Design a protein around this ligand. Sequence first.
Ligand code: MG
Ligand code: MG
Ligand code: MG
Ligand code: MG
Ligand code: MG
Ligand code: MG
Ligand code: MG
Ligand code: MG
Ligand code: MG
Ligand code: MG
Ligand code: MG
Ligand code: MG
Ligand code: MG
Ligand code: MG
Ligand code: MG
Ligand code: MG
Ligand code: MG
Ligand code: MG
Ligand code: MG
Ligand code: MG
Ligand code: MG
Ligand code: MG
Ligand code: MG
Ligand code: MG
Ligand code: MG
Ligand code: MG
Ligand code: MG
Ligand code: MG
Ligand code: MG
Ligand code: MG
Ligand code: MG
Ligand code: MG
Ligand code: MG
Ligand code: MG
Ligand code: MG
Ligand code: MG
Ligand code: MG
Ligand code: ZN
Lengths: 208, 151, 138, 237
Amino acid sequence: GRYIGPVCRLCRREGVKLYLKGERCYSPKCAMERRPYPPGQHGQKRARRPSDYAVRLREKQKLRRIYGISERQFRNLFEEASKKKGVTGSVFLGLLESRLDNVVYRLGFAVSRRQARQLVRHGHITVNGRRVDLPSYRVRPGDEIAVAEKSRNLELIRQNLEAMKGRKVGPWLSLDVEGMKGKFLRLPDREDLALPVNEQLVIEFYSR
Amino acid sequence: DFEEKMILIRRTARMQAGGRRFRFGALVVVGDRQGRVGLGFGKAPEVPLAVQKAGYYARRNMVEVPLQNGTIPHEIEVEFGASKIVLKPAAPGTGVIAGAVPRAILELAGVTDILTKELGSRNPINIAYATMEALRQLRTKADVERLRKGE
Amino acid sequence: MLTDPIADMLTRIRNATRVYKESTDVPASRFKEEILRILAREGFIKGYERVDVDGKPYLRVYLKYGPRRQGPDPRPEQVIHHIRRISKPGRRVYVGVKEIPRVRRGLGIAILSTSKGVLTDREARKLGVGGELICEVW
Amino acid sequence: EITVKELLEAGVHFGHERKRWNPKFARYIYAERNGIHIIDLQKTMEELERTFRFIEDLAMRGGTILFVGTKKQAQDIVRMEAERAGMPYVNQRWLGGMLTNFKTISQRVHRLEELEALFASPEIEERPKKEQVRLKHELERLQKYLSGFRLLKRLPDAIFVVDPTKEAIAVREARKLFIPVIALADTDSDPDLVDYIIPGNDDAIRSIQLILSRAVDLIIQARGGVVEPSPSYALVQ
RNA sequence: GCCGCGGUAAUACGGAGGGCGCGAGCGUUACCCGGAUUCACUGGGCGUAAAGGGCGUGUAGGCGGCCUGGGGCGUCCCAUGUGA
RNA sequence: GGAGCAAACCGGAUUAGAUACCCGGGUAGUCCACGCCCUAAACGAUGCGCGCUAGGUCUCUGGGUCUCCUGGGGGCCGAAGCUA
RNA sequence: AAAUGU
Ligand SMILES: [Mg+2]
Ligand SMILES: [Mg+2]
Ligand SMILES: [Mg+2]
Ligand SMILES: [Mg+2]
Ligand SMILES: [Mg+2]
Ligand SMILES: [Mg+2]
Ligand SMILES: [Mg+2]
Ligand SMILES: [Mg+2]
Ligand SMILES: [Mg+2]
Ligand SMILES: [Mg+2]
Ligand SMILES: [Mg+2]
Ligand SMILES: [Mg+2]
Ligand SMILES: [Mg+2]
Ligand SMILES: [Mg+2]
Ligand SMILES: [Mg+2]
Ligand SMILES: [Mg+2]
Ligand SMILES: [Mg+2]
Ligand SMILES: [Mg+2]
Ligand SMILES: [Mg+2]
Ligand SMILES: [Mg+2]
Ligand SMILES: [Mg+2]
Ligand SMILES: [Mg+2]
Ligand SMILES: [Mg+2]
Ligand SMILES: [Mg+2]
Ligand SMILES: [Mg+2]
Ligand SMILES: [Mg+2]
Ligand SMILES: [Mg+2]
Ligand SMILES: [Mg+2]
Ligand SMILES: [Mg+2]
Ligand SMILES: [Mg+2]
Ligand SMILES: [Mg+2]
Ligand SMILES: [Mg+2]
Ligand SMILES: [Mg+2]
Ligand SMILES: [Mg+2]
Ligand SMILES: [Mg+2]
Ligand SMILES: [Mg+2]
Ligand SMILES: [Mg+2]
Ligand SMILES: [Zn+2]
């Protein structure tokens, strides 16, 4: 199944923090803070100039490693995107973001997408009143994601739900913090998040 | 200001009585990503001086690159020696579909959406020198009527 | 003999242009005519004049160019950057009104013989015809 | 006035060459008599008319013109002129790079000036008899190839040629640098590579001295004072 | 897989540590298309790189100059059926 | 038919050897008629015909109001252009 | 007269 194990090695290697843990990857020490250099014996050594391929490679993984999914599931979406209308590329992020488990991270019901997933998988999450246990669900506008009844309580939700009081959730997002529910509003334009990534290259990569 | 970029370094070697002496060659692109690109070729006893004088030589053969939002006004194909480059426009959200030599130019002239092929001798040097000559022969619907007139 | 006269015309021009001359004389036809015409109507040429030479009719075709550029080789840009026969006696090219060129993205112009005559890509599309593609020019 | 009419064109300034010619020299040709090609002067002046219409505007805004001519037919004529116009010139023999590598050759006139700083300076005697002549020998050559080039401290904005055939080197150097090219040319060379032309005998002092002497007068007449007729018809003829 | 690595200091063998890449999959072999514009209609060549017939005459065949008619075969348009 | 020449053949030299090179000999063949064979660096290593695109010089051969012009050949250098 | 060199 998914990637499991050493994560903080990945806020690094890619050479850029990508907030993959809970509070740690947000706390003074995200595998990069202390050691902002690539993993393994050859860490504190001077890099040689990457290949153009290498450059494109690292950029893709980064993005995937951010959303944290199989190369299987990942590329389908690219080709799907690659097939569609006009920009037929940048739209990609929209398809990535429509993932249930992705959304739940943004909706602050959890902090790691990894934590998000275990919820959806354990089916602590519902959509439009439906017990939905599938982290791949491409959600759409006006769909509603809320905690189920057997789990409205649960220590893990409350604090995770609470700490959200502070920030303006995504333009495409909305949250009844007390009501434990959110609405997918719209398709996040490229504007709506300057990811640390240059998606232009992922395209360039996948056209091998 | 400008945006340098080498796409080629190489080590030639003449020969002398006892041993072979060397020289290094460097091909640098220099752009603005706004429609201005240049290209010169550096040859010097050691590496960086060439690279340096490449970028010197580069900022000469500059070129109006009359974009039409991240693309070219029309399709062009040019032949340099026995090397051949095909330039084809593209609707936005396409990509810069090119080898490593020409994409290391079209980007620095702007161009976010273009289709390309190399044909004949894929030698980078003579390929580079070609592509420039393609841009230099780009003409705009504006550029044309200036000619298809009277007096 | 001349297997193809139309090609010979185009080729005569292309030869003349590359040395930047005033005029270019070429044997006459009512079909070579309404083929030129466009080249004035689209302003690829100044124009022509039906004349006679040594008792025999020709069509002095007057060449446009551009600005005396500067730098080494001050020779001006051409008006006619490119021109080549398409349909030939060795292989005749016919097209439906759909299957019709977008020469140099609108900047270029095809020339075709049709059920209404020497149209262009633009025209033949709008009249809704298509026919024997003679040549492409830009 | 400012100008000259075809009655003055009676020296040689009609043509003198033929068959040793470039056919580019069409239009500015009249007919072939005595085998020699002859060129109409209606156009010669018409060109001068056009040509001078670019010289004055250039001169009267205080530009600079470099003078080139290595023909023994036109050596000294230009020297006087460009001195009589206080302008730089190349009488002697032309050097590659001079414009395209201007910056580099320019450091050689400094040495000339740097040398001249040792004529009566307090170190001449204080440098041995041996070297004393060597530098003086190094001097006398330096001045020869840099006299009319010692003037100017930056590339001009036009250059005047007595025969663009020969100084095509210079013409190429100039042309590569968007530098306006003007020339007295006969059937020898050829137009196109010229921006402003004096189609006439580019040999036989008459045409040269005629058009060259008068050319200078045009400059002053846009700088201040066309003083007495400069030397000419001395041993000249 | 090709270019090639091993001759007492091997990032190329063998193990180890570490790293890259996929993940209930990862490799390999065989085969088809791509890249190959390397059968080239789109879209190539034949002086010295492989390629002009040793040279004529000529059958079928391919191709054909300038003008005006008739025919409308090709070609072009429209409509319609068919194209499961 | 056969003078001269000359594969093969013999001899003299050279050489380690010399079935070669150089030398003295020498038969087919070389020449004629008739009939076969059909190869080649059979080369401009460039197929044929027509049209178009600067000139300079040397020459062979026609015609011209014989400078010069023009026609058809045989070479050189060369505009533009082509070419690795 | 005058050969050869994992
Ligand atoms: Mg698309
Ligand atoms: Mg080629
Ligand atoms: Mg190849
Ligand atoms: Mg290669
Ligand atoms: Mg050991
Ligand atoms: Mg060892
Ligand atoms: Mg070793
Ligand atoms: Mg290996
Ligand atoms: Mg190993
Ligand atoms: Mg290990
Ligand atoms: Mg390992
Ligand atoms: Mg073909
Ligand atoms: Mg080929
Ligand atoms: Mg051929
Ligand atoms: Mg061979
Ligand atoms: Mg061969
Ligand atoms: Mg042959
Ligand atoms: Mg044959
Ligand atoms: Mg045969
Ligand atoms: Mg026949
Ligand atoms: Mg027929
Ligand atoms: Mg016919
Ligand atoms: Mg149908
Ligand atoms: Mg004998
Ligand atoms: Mg013997
Ligand atoms: Mg013996
Ligand atoms: Mg023995
Ligand atoms: Mg013998
Ligand atoms: Mg052969
Ligand atoms: Mg031939
Ligand atoms: Mg044949
Ligand atoms: Mg004859
Ligand atoms: Mg005669
Ligand atoms: Mg001839
Ligand atoms: Mg030649
Ligand atoms: Mg030339
Ligand atoms: Mg042996
Ligand atoms: Zn971390």
